[PDB]
C-alpha cells in the first residue's frame, strides 16, 4: 500500500543509513527483497580556478546523489511509524510515499 525513499551524497553514508532502515522497518513484518544500488547522478561541479584575471582553467569537484528505495511490501502504516521517529543520522533524507 505504501513505499519509502532514502537520499544521500555518499556511498558509505547511504549504506550506514540502509543498515538502520532494514533494522527499523523490515524485521516485523519480515521483508526479504535486498537493496538495489540505483544511479548516482554523477556530474562535475565547476568554477574558475583563480579569483582574478584567469578564465581559462576550472576547478574540478565530484558530485553524486545516491538513491535507495530499499523496498517494503507490508501495507500497514506501522511499517514506517518507527522510521519516522528513530535515527537515521545527520546527512540523509527519508521520504514516505502513498
Amino acid at each position: 500500500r505504501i513505499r519509502i525513499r532514502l537520499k544521500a551524497f555518499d556511498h558509505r553514508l547511504i549504506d550506514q543509513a540502509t543498515a538502520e532502515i532494514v533494522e527499523t522497518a523490515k524485521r516485523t513484518g519480515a521483508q526479504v527483497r535486498g537493496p538495489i544500488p540505483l544511479p548516482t547522478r554523477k556530474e562535475r561541479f565547476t568554477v574558475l580556478i583563480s579569483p582574478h584575471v584567469n578564465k581559462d582553467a576550472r576547478d574540478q569537484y565530484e558530485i553524486r546523489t545516491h538513491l535507495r528505495l530499499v523496498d517494503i511490501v507490508e501495507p500497514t502504516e506501522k511499517t514506517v511509524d518507527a522510521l519516522m521517529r528513530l535515527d537515521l543520522a545527520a546527512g540523509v533524507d527519508v521520504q514516505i510515499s502513498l
Binding site: F9, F45, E62, R64, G91
Partner: peptide, 13 residues
C-alpha cells in the same frame, strides 16, 4: 569553504 569540505556532497580530488 569549498576546499575545506564545508559544502555537503562536494568531493575532491
Amino acid at each position: 569553504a569549498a576546499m575545506r569540505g564545508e559544502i555537503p556532497g562536494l568531493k575532491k580530488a
